[PDB]
Amino acid sequence: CPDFGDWKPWTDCLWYPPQHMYSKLSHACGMHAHRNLTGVMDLPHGHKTPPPCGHCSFKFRCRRRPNTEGCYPLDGEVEVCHDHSDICTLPKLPHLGCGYAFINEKLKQCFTRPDTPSYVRLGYRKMFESIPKKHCIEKDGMCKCCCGDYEPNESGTECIKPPAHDCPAYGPPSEWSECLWFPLKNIVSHVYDHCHVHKEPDGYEPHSVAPANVHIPEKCGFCSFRVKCMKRDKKDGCFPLKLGKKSCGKDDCPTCGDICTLDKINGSCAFPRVMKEKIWDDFTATSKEKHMPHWKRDGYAKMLMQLPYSNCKEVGDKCKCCCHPYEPNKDGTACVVKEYCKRVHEL
Numbered sequence: 001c002p003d004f005g006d007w008k009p010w011t012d013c014l015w016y017p018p019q020h021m022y023s024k025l026s027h028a029c030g031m032h033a034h035r036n037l038t039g040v041m042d043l044p045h046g047h048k049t050p051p052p053c054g055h056c057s058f059k060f061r062c063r064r065r066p067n068t069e070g071c072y073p074l075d076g077e078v079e080v081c082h083d084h085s086d087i088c089t090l091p092k093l094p095h096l097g098c099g100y101a102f103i104n105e106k107l108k109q110c111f112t113r114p115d116t117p118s119y120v121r122l123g124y125r126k127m128f129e130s131i132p133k134k135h136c137i138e139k140d141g142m143c144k145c146c147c148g149d150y151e152p153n154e155s156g157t158e159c160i161k162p163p164a165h166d167c168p169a170y171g172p173p174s175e176w177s178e179c180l181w182f183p184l185k186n187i188v189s190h191v192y193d194h195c196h197v198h199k200e201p202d203g204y205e206p207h208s209v210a211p212a213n214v215h216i217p218e219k220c221g222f223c224s225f226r227v228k229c230m231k232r233d234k235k236d237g238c239f240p241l242k243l244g245k246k247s248c249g250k251d252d253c254p255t256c257g258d259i260c261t262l263d264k265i266n267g268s269c270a271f272p273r274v275m276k277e278k279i280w281d282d283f284t285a286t287s288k289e290k291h292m293p294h295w296k297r298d299g300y301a302k303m304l305m306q307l308p309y310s311n312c313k314e315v316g317d318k319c320k321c322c323c324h325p326y327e328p329n330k331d332g333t334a335c336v337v338k339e340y341c342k343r344v345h346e347l
């Protein structure tokens with residue numbers, strides 16, 4: 001590939017809300033901010049965004065080259081603004097609790113489509129990973145958060161810099177798995193097998209919150225997905241397994257890209273969301289029962305974010321469903337990419 005044209009000017013120290021930070025990042029690369037991220041990962045209704053805090057604010061700069069096959073067009077650099085060092089105080093998120101470290105998976109999954117080119121996926125991954133990583137603890141019904149090399153002290157009153165965790169090196173990534181499908185226990189078993197890991201006796205495992213014998217149709221809705229594993233040895237402060245996902249479509253199995261048709265439950269198509277809420281409520285409660293430190297909670301939660309997340313339209317007597325980053329089209333006949341996930345040229 002050709003080398004980048006290098007650097008446009010550094011931004012000011014950047015901050016939230018997400019739409020505003022995305023706008024400044026996009027302008028920094030010399031591009032219009034065409035996505036509307038409002039409502040995708042905002043704070044719960046009624047909560048003001050606090051001022052720059054936690055070593056979480058940062059400057060950004062960008063460089064550009066032509067978008068060629070195999071040559072991602074953009075390249076970024078991040079410099080943390082450590083002047084804004086007071087600990088962040090944030091509300092608990094519905095179902096996720098102090099989930100600020102892994103909510104970004106919703107946006108990363110925009111580039112997990114079967115038709116996302118590998119070089120595109122890797123280019124956006126580099127961007128996402130450069131954002132300062134959040135480390136949160138819960139104190140008296142609120143979240144106390146610091147980013148990057150800083151973590152909350154035990155009392156959640158200050159951001160401190162622990163000794164470097166010096167995590168062991170990852171081994172080679174696996175290949176993609178085959179397309180995985182429900183029931184959930186089969187998905188879980190396949191992850192253990194594909195990633196060559198164990199159910200730690202103290203560990204967490206999601207259990208089906210589905211009724212006794214609900215009908216599971218053939219793979220559909222871009223809901224079936226492949227996984228790719230990167231694994232490192234255990235070490236305190238270091239979660240050992242990182243998972244990537246890639247949805248399956250019509251070139252992966254013949255029904256995989258067709259909309260899902262399900263029966264209604266209790267006269268509605270809400271049951272997928274209800275089940276998702278239950279799984280997260282149970283995980284969040286388990287993370288506290290088992291006294292999980294933030295790095296371990298976050299590691300499990302990032303994997304749990306990879307489960308299929310459905311949106312359904314009720315059409316006649318049936319539910320027509322697709323999984324993120326897809327949603328049903330207007331008449332419930334096909335699956336389409338959510339607008340804020342579309343590639344820039346598809347917008």
Ligand SMILES: *[C@@H]1O[C@H](CO)[C@@H](O)[C@H](O)[C@H]1NC(C)=O
Pocket residue numbers: 036037038039
């Ligand atoms: C952006 O999305 C939010 C929520 O979906 C909506 O309330 C808002 O009006 C949208 N803005 C534009 C300019 O489309």
Ligand SMILES: *[C@@H]1O[C@H](CO)[C@@H](O)[C@H](O)[C@H]1NC(C)=O
Pocket residue numbers: 211265266271
């Ligand atoms: C259906 O309704 C019953 C009682 O109203 C409730 O217990 C159940 O969780 C609902 N959904 C399913 C899938 O059973």
Ligand SMILES: [Ca+2]
Pocket residue numbers: 251252
């Ligand atoms: Ca393929």
